[PDB]
């Protein structure tokens, strides 16, 4: 599909058995999801943007479906204000920018 940018590019994702709305975010290196109690091992990480850094939990090889396209990779979980799909998964679903 083609998604214009008049509004926030929010799509439905499926992860850890939950459906959520998330931003398709070309500005994000990594994928960052709102706090959720995922099972498995994780590693601490800090990620930074406007305002400063937040503490997140890094989970690897997590299956995630984005707008009906399957992907699997690293997901960062913590107190982000919005669910963010980053380039690590955008590449997996063949997402490009076009103008």
Ligand X SMILES: CC[C@H](C)CN(C[C@@H](O)[C@H](Cc1ccccc1)NC(=O)OCCNC(=O)C(Cl)Cl)S(=O)(=O)c1ccc(OC)cc1
| Contact positions vs a second copy (CB under 8 A) | 1-6, 8-9, 23-29, 32, 47-54, 67, 69, 80-82, 84, 87, 90-91, 93-99
Identify the CA nearest to 13 among candidates 58, 55, 75: 75
CA dihedral 34, 32, 42, 17 (to 10 degrees): 60
List beta partners, residue 77: 33, 57
9 neighbors 23 (Cβ within 8 angstroms): yes
Beta carbon nearer to a second copy, 38 or 54: 54
Beta carbon nearer to ligand X, 17 or 32: 32
Residue 2 interface partner, choices a second copy, ligand X, none, CB cut-off 5-8 Å depending on type: a second copy
Residue 30 interface partner, choices ligand X, a second copy, none, CB cut-off 5-8 Å depending on type: ligand X
Beta carbon nearer to a second copy, 58 or 80: 80
Identify the CA nearest to 12 among candidates 61, 77, 63, 67: 67
Write out the two tokens for 73. 């990779």
Catalytic residues: 25
Residues that bind ligand X (CB under 6 A): 25, 27-30, 32, 47-50, 80-82, 84, 86
């Amino acid at each position: 599909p083609q998604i214009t940018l008049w509004k926030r590019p929010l799509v439905t994702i499926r992860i850890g058995g939950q459906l959520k709305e998330a931003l398709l975010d070309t500005g994000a290196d990594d994928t960052v999801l709102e706090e959720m109690n995922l099972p498995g091992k994780w590693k601490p990480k800090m990620i930074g943007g406007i305002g400063g850094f937040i503490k997140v939990r890094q989970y690897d090889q997590i299956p995630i479906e984005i707008c009906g396209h399957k992907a699997i990779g690293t997901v960062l979980v913590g107190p982000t204000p919005v669910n963010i799909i980053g380039r690590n998964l955008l590449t997996q679903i063949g997402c490009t920018l076009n103008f």
